[PDB]
Design a protein around this ligand. Sequence first.
Ligand SMILES: [Cu+2]
Ligand SMILES: [Cu+2]
Length: 305
Amino acid sequence: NECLGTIGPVTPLDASDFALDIRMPGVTPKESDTYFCMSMRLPVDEEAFVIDFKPRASMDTVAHMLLFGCNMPSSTGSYWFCDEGTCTDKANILYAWARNAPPTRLPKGVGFRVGGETGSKYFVLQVHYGDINHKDCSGVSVHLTRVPQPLIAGMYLMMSVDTVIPPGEKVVNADISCQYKMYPMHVFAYRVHTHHLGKVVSGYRVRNGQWTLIGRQNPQLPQAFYPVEHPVDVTFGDILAARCVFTGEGRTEATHIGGTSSDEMCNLYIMYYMEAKYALSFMTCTKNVAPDMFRTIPAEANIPI
Ligand SMILES: [Cu+2]
Ligand SMILES: [Cu+2]
């Protein structure tokens, strides 16, 4: 969509509500497969709750977009190259968008809590461009009310650290496993990033070895925030298990976990809501404390698609 210039990025929708348009300050990218980043501070210096997302990019030429919150972006830029980087702190993701894969709405009564003493001070907008003279604005409008929300959003990231894929190695599994600590969470959507060797990602709840699937996606598919059929009450003492499967047939050297095209990532992003009272904005698992368990896993997790 177009550029604003005289209208600016902030739109009141009334007093206790406005939308915020986060869009690249007129960019002219002359590369195919190019990742561009930029940051914007909150208008209000407080607890807002981010309640919607209106996506706006030339389907022509915009492959995928990610929006996270964090309190210190990786450059003082007008824009920059995301390979340079997002937030030098934890960038916790709010929104993801894919072309061939329209996202879903948040549920009414839900919102990511931002700013204030605790919440995120900045939004950072990663914007992937596909194949390709002029000037580009495209990106994401928000809609954030000051009105507190019943159900707070957040992310449980399960991600491998140590994984390694030996070259030509028909199959290498990577497994994450964590025990649940906080108040329960209903899980309403998901996404799954891995680079190429990604055959398939998948993730579950386990209550007395009782596997009840969350998400399953071949990560070469556009890694949107895909919805979870019927919601999943993750309570205390449940185990989050996840498996990315990769192959090594592809390249001539040892692939390890990393943020570059040549490396791999087994990330599984798990977007939940919790009761306001009990809610906390993001959890994480870098461990695989229940490793043996996984024999019990579904074979739906180990065969492809
Ligand atoms: Cu429930
Ligand atoms: Cu990556």
